[model samples]
Target: GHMDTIILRNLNPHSTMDSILGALAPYAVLSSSNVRVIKDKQTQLNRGFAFIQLSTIEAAQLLQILQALHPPLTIDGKTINVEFAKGS
Candidate 1:
């Protein structure tokens, strides 16, 4: 199946959701679609992650580019890892 959702994990826990989105906005088309952060209050350490849905695999090309760069995003004074979510 084609890719749908890419989950960015290990985000800087202290960063606000908006900061995260801003950091990621340039990496992909996040402002136009169903792009948003998943705030799980019950999760460990109040650390949250963001979810982005690509329009198609072609759109997913950005993800591939991001993965190659392996950029360490800085937010709230810390760097965090970002990548595609695992499939079961």
Candidate 2:
């Protein structure tokens, strides 16, 4: 199966790679190497968004769970929005 990717948004400006790992721990995560948070060039601050790659089977399973969630999902006290990546 092909790997899958998702876009995460509405992240706290202070969100870090560690926090993301924690938030996603409840689900299938093949590797954290592909996880990435968009950052500003000069300030090096998180842009409140990120991308994560999951195993193909895991991605489908997680997507179903995420779609059923209401008011979005919260991680580290910040509400987050999720979507399939454009080309995923």
Candidate 3:
């Protein structure tokens, strides 16, 4: 089976699992558990990036949808940077 993982960068430092899920609401996401954002061990706040896993065949389609959004997808003025996961 093919594995599809998207890496999202330039996100707000305060980004949360719920927030990421909301941004991806338009797509056929596999599950919320698949979304993850790195955080500081002390503060437990987002580290400004996240990872989203999608169905292998739907990965490319999601990229197209993201590119079509005006002003780009953002949260609190932070523009989102979407790309294929490294080492995929």
| Most TM-score-accurate candidate | 3
Q: For candidate 1, list the clashing residue pairs, or say none.
A: none
Mind giving the per-residue lDDT tens digits that candidate 2 earns over 1-88?
Answer: 2247777788877677777776654644536676788777787679888877766666667777767755554666887777785353
Q: Estimate each model's TM-score.
A: 0.63, 0.69, 0.72
Least accurate 10 contiguous residues by lDDT in model 2: 23-32
Measured with C-alpha atoms, the lDDT of residue 3 in candidate 2 is 49
* TM-score between candidate 3 and the true structure: 0.72
Q: 1-88 in candidate 3: lDDT tens per residue?
A: 3267777788776778787677656655547767778789898778887777666657767777766775456656777777775344
Candidate 2 Cα deviation (angstroms), residue 85:
2.6
Q: Distance (Å) between predicted and true CA of 4, model 1?
A: 1.9
What C-alpha lDDT does candidate 3 achieve relative to the native structure? 0.70
Better of 1 and 3 by lDDT: 3
Q: What's every prediction's RMSD, in angstroms?
A: 3.7, 3.3, 2.9
